[PDB]
Amino acid sequence: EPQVQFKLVLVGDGGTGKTTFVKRHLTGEFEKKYVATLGVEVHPLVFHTNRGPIKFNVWDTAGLEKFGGLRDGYYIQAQCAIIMFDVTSRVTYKNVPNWHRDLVRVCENIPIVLCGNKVDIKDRKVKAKSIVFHRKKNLQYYDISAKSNYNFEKPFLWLARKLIGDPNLEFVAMP
Amino acid sequence: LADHAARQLLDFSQKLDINLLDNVVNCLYHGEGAQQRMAQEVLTHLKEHPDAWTRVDTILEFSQNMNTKYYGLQILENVIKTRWKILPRNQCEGIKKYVVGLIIKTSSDPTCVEKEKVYIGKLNMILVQILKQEWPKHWPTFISDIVGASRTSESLCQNNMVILKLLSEEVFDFSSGQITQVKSKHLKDSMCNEFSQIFQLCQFVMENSQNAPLVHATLETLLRFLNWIPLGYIFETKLISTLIYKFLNVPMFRNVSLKCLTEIAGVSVSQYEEQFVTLFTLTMMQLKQMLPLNTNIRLAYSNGKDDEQNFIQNLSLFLCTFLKEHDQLIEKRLNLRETLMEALHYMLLVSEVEETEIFKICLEYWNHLAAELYRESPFSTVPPRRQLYLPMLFKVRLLMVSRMAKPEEAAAVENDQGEVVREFMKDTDSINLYKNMRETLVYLTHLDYVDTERIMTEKLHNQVNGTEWSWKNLNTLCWAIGSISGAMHEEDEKRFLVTVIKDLLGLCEQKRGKDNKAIIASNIMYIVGQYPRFLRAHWKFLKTVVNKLFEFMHETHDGVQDMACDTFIKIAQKCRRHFVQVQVGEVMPFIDEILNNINTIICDLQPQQVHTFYEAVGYMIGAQTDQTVQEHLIEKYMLLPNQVWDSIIQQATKNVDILKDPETVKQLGSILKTNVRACKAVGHPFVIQLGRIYLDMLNVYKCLSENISAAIQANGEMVTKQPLIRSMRTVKRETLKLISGWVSRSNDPQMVAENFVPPLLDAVLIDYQRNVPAAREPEVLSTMAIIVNKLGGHITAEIPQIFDAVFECTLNMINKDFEEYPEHRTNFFLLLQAVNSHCFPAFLAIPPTQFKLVLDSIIWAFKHTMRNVADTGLQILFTLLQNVAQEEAAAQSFYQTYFCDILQHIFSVVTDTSHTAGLTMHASILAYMFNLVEEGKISTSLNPGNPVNNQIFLQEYVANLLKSAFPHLQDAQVKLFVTGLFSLNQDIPAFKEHLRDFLVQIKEFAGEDTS
Ligand SMILES: *[C@H](CC(=O)O)[C@H](C)[C@@H](O)/C=C/C(=C\[C@H](C)C/C=C/C(C)=C/[C@@H](C)C(=O)[C@@H](C)[C@H](O)[C@@H](C)C/C(C)=C/C(=O)O)CC
Ligand SMILES: Nc1nc2c(ncn2[C@@H]2O[C@H](COP(=O)(O)OP(=O)(O)OP(=O)(O)O)[C@@H](O)[C@H]2O)c(=O)[nH]1
């Protein structure tokens, strides 16, 4: 059916795994090393749902202040967004409000998922009981792990539902 | 679309080709791929250039597309953020008037609500930046100017409401880290000082205006204001009444309004009691109008549109907030019983919404209520508050039992090799959700064991008749049944379990077929495992259960075997005693029967399940206290794996090439995994098994290592993905795992050091040095780390030779960038931290050039952007400074040689925007170091300048270092920061805020005084 693409903007603190996440979704590869994204790289991801395929042009942005680039600007003309932090670094969570502020000041009304990455690491520092920012901002939250595939596709699934309008969409991974 | 065209954009000798700038920006947003990277580079490059804003006006005047205007606004924001205090005053006035004039012109056009809202928001943000930069001093009438100009036009007023909201956000919500501390206090005092005028405007718009967008913007602003404003504006005005009556019930305003109410409900203050009651009363009187209590809120949310869903979530938030903070106020007012119940009823309805986030919001309050009632009195079927809540506690118990989340979470995860292992995720949101439902249900079960038992009996009756029969529903019921374990007295618990097990047995017998019997059989297994007290109390019951699990370990049906093994390990851990001691009616302890039948029990299990089995048995063996009986148990325990192990060792002695046979290496890896699990369970006494295979094991490690290394040299990196090399690396990793795992649990450092360590030196360490870079196993370093951490002194003497093998050759793998070979970087600095932390005399016992190399590696560590690497590097440096301070003899020489060097490196990191995550450590170090110079340092850092004390030399040296590092700083700025380094060296968070202030200062130019 229609190739229905949307702009996703992916943000978060440095070395949070945004790029590792997109790598594994694009090629199944898990990158072990931190190679800081300069400015932003836009990779397209295509999933296939029971109701036709869906395309996410993912704008993986740079969390490092040094290499932010046109930080504010990349958010323009964006349909949806993901904000990521690291459950092993309290700092990465304390900065979630800042990413969210800078994000909703540009695109005032888009679906945003909040992800806590690296939930596979046994010495978790951002306690699960403590993630409550998304409540009053009406954001949806998940506990992805880019290495374990824990809730691997749930952010894209939720966004695809919130964008297509079918609360029962399903990924089928067809050829 | 060419690099030259892009380069033209930045000549500064000719007018800007706004045509070309639009094309490059359109390439930035719609440019496909390979020039997109180019266009972004050029736009960033121009934006960061010193000339900057000279063209901003040109861009805004002539450009046709929004994106280019937004880009110009970015350049303007940059200038205002950084170089505003150095623009000539008239330039600032011109920019001020240009900005407010553009804001005026944009709002007046109708299209502003239409088209590029983004652009208007960016402009308002520009103005807020100007305000942040100079609002009180250089614009003393601003609040008055715009408050007055808001009563002139309404569109102007709406946009100014947005501006005031952004100012509140920038002053009160995001001031720390963007604004220096004193200036933050100043902006907060200035806004708090002129606020009544703003609040007048807001009351006026709320009470009088009929412009719906303006009203909405005013309410949105009132939200952020509720964050910080004095309580007098909230609880001593028309505000609560105005919100509830004029805005809460009308559709387009119900969300914002309720949010405000929720914020007001969050305030915990004793003086506004009545007001809070009012806030509840009135709010309830409105909800019953918009959401009648008969409503299926589950369906209303499931079908409803976005703002309906948001209103339901905001309602859950409001009721949870207010009830948690002020349930007491409504409890002690009889005339409000009915209303309180109604609110609780609401929560119950909202709890049926199938949305885990809203449900967590509700479960927060349910846990609060159950915990309060339990803390009041913990006894069953009377205290007053529980008498108030009694008419609906059973509804809450039914909710918990009916929607219980799954207790544990398993998943198939593939390792660095191909192996997919079954990993239980340990600490997740869903598991925390289960634990909260469990806590609530256990509280309420203590409040009435009969009611919980009754609800469960009814659910299970409905299972038996087939009315509510589903794999899902039986699973949920059994999860609840397990979740209340320990809540009842052992006698009540026994009577209850007897019935549960009997009825589940009957249900099994009733359903036929493997799929139904499999589901019922696990649920039974789960329930039995969750009640270890019952199992310890009845011996035959337990023996028969264990006999069945062994039976189920032959069921080919998927998941029966896995659940059998999981339940076996749970029961073994929780009842290990009962397997080693002789039981009533038994001739020998059960462990001997199990050990005599291992080969009968595990013949049909898959390898991972066999590993689980051996761990479960190892717990039992560890329970046996007599050392000799335990040795014999261990010997029979490891009989079967040792047979295959000895067969393979003998074949290898006859011919080494069987160590290139795939199935042989698979078997070796499986045997080693079995040994690893057995070692985890048994603990130290496992040494008897370890020493039995140790040398042999090391041998095969060496051989396989060499194989992999050669396999690299023949075919490069690719070869590391083939199945055979993969299983060989598995053997190596399990060998290291077994070694370090036994060493971790060994209570004799003497024997470990003299017996088990020396073979590692040639078998693994020099082998690691001899390997090709890509073949080196990082897990070597980490394992050595563990050994060091456990051995302590018993291994100091061996630090040199170890470092001979691993140190030099590892550095050269990880000192040509910050990124390649990450596992090696992490494990390397882990090993180095272990040595510094537990074997510091070894650092004192090496040549000074080599100690320089070690210190350089530490510095190299904390320069990483890999957070864990830099973090352990800072920890190493801190404990190293203290270790040096421990001995007076070398301490002064170390200071004379390295103090200033360390200081300048750490300053290079502290002023780096990429290392802020380490601030707490940075401070702790610098503080310490600077405190050291106040006193406790005797010799002089500079031989030429001995007159100057270290404080004088340190002060001027660090000030010179910063002045040359950041040339745009003022002398006064640097002197103040350098003296603050000494003044705050015993208040670590104040020191930290001093560093953060300086880190803000180094980002913006300043002219003459702070002004
Ligand atoms: C399928 C049944 C079918 O297809 O017909 C199911 C899934 C079964 O295969 C699974 C059964 C499992 C466990 C059983 C509960 C194990 C049996 C225990 C047993 C027979 C205990 C004896 C010794 C008793 O005393 C019984 C009669 C008694 O009711 C026990 C349960 C309580 C006691 C000891 C009472 C007391 O007061 O002491 C799968 C794990
Ligand atoms: N344990 C664990 N580590 C992870 C996970 N995801 C990523 N990492 C690690 O964390 C780092 C992530 O690096 P990137 O994915 O490049 O990070 P990034 O967010 O793109 O970085 P920037 O683009 O600079 O903001 C790497 O070192 C990964 O190995 C995960 O799920 N679990």
Ligand SMILES: [Mg+2]
């Ligand atoms: Mg990246």
